[PDB]
Amino acid sequence: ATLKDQLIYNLLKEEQTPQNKITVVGVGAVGMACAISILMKDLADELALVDVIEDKLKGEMMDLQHGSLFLRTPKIVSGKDYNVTANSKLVIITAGARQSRLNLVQRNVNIFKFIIPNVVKYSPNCKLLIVSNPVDILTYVAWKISGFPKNRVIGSGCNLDSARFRYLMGERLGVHPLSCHGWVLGEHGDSSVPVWSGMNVAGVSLKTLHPDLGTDKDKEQWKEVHKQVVESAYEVIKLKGYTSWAIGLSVADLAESIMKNLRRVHPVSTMIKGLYGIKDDVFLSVPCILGQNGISDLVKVTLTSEEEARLKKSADTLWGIQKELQF
Template sequence: MRKIIRPEGFSNYLNLYRSFASKCGGKSDEKEAKKSAFSSLVKPMKDSKRKPGFKITVVGAGKVGLACCSYLLDRRLAKELVIMDIQYERAQAEALDFNHGSVFLGEPKVVACGDGAHTKDSDLIVFTAGVRPGKKSRLEVMHDTVKILKAVVPKLVELSPKAIYLVIANPADVMTYAFQKIGKLPKHRCFTSGCHLDTARFRYYVAQHLKVPASAVQGFVIGEHGDSAVPVWSSVQVAGSCLRDVAKNPGCGDDPEKWAEIERKVICGGASVSRVKGYTDWAVALSAIDIVEAISGPYGKIMSVGTDMKGIQGIEDNVVLSMPCMVTSAGISYIYEMALTNGEYEKLHKSADILLKAQCKLKL
């Protein structure tokens, strides 16, 4: 082993450097940052330290599940991918189809599973299995999907107790509540993509209205991933400018520029696609993969995802809905309390009441 030779007086120089660094942005600055004004908006989650992994299970080989698998492999996010479906032969065929093209995908390991055995020690489980709403609303099909959860979740959690669980099955908010209860999982490791897709639609339609790229628009949709979703107009920014500073009454009151039409498109966006296709898959999968990238990346990302929001924005009950959250390799690390107008605050609480009533109807 080579001996490190330090020049004479090195220790004195090192002490001087540490003293200088402390004064110019060292540990003392970190402590001050935690006490900044912005920190009052940040609500840390407990036990959120975890290393990123590379084994991913997708439960459900339907349209959304397979779209997720395709993106996961194409973006090299899974070194090992498990496709789990009760129709084992179908899952096996899909896995084989991907393996035939593995040379184009970085040669990942793709396996099929029918009973959950191959999911053992997964780092991330994306749950897409559920009953397709069809002509029914998301909330109307929840009892049938809960039956699936009761049959599958206990074994998944037993085999992968430290995994992060991302719930895509509809109704996403209520199913996440059921998933947390059935699996006895902490809320920072079991959450739903929630309003992340609604937020993307919101940015898209605002951008279309203003004839700018969607990447130039910043804003969030919060609350239910469904009919009572709340676009937060008061915080929308376009190219660094607040929309409400340049547009008259976006989303409320007298509406000469017809911003309310955008809100309608955001809430009905999925239905407008499924009326023709019979389902939605690409955008749902893309929103899920964006979350997976945040989990697998080094820095994380702030996005509107859903988990138990008791204690946030005055919500007093254990109800799952979406708010801006920092998603990292540990799951949800922080929840951000946005500054809402009185009207937005009231809409959020109405959304929470709708979801709470739905949760109470579940037989868990």
């Protein structure tokens, strides 16, 4: 017999559906950062990568595979064909077209019209995590095309924005970001909302201590912290050409909550119809409880009139683009 048969006696060839599988779609900088972070946090028992550039895809797969001795994810697969993604619990979408606003979103619609039905065909029960920008519109697109219930379509939304905010808050106060609490909500990008009323260390509200916090009268101009959050991508892109590591870590944190059913609260993009006077089918970031069935619950943050008006404006602008899209 073979050396394998001389060395190993088989009790059963009988294999099983992979039980904790993750797919990442897109193997650019963002997708590969998501992949390595997922691998180093031992979240999946099988990882699949899909992209349309076949050589790059195979090379990235192989490079990860060659690290297998130092990982605990025993199977890594890839291919242009979505059959490699079958029975994924979670599918992370990072592919898309990069930038006209309506035309750009329509180009990503046409891309998602190929990707999403493929994903659904092979993992009809998966959760979808949309990272591709503009994430709030593209989470809607994914939801529309998939037919999935709202709970199973999640946008990375303001998760990273909020992490950057807490990083920056930590530097100002000299405290680890883990102990600096603060939420950036709404539309990911220039119109996101820093919720001053919820910023705290050890349950001590900064706004109560410093009533002018986040206003034009603030002697310390904490508004600049939010400006830095919305500028951060630009600044990093100007310096290294793209952003990758921070988004990969933040996405892995979201995957952890879903795959381990933790029901931690994260600021991610979900369908907000019914809240803040919004009546259109639009997705925006609010704090959501994340777990095994995706977004089961959301936190009803108390917002001021101005903060609600900002979320409503974003919603109006997003709906205006969305009604003009062709599915």
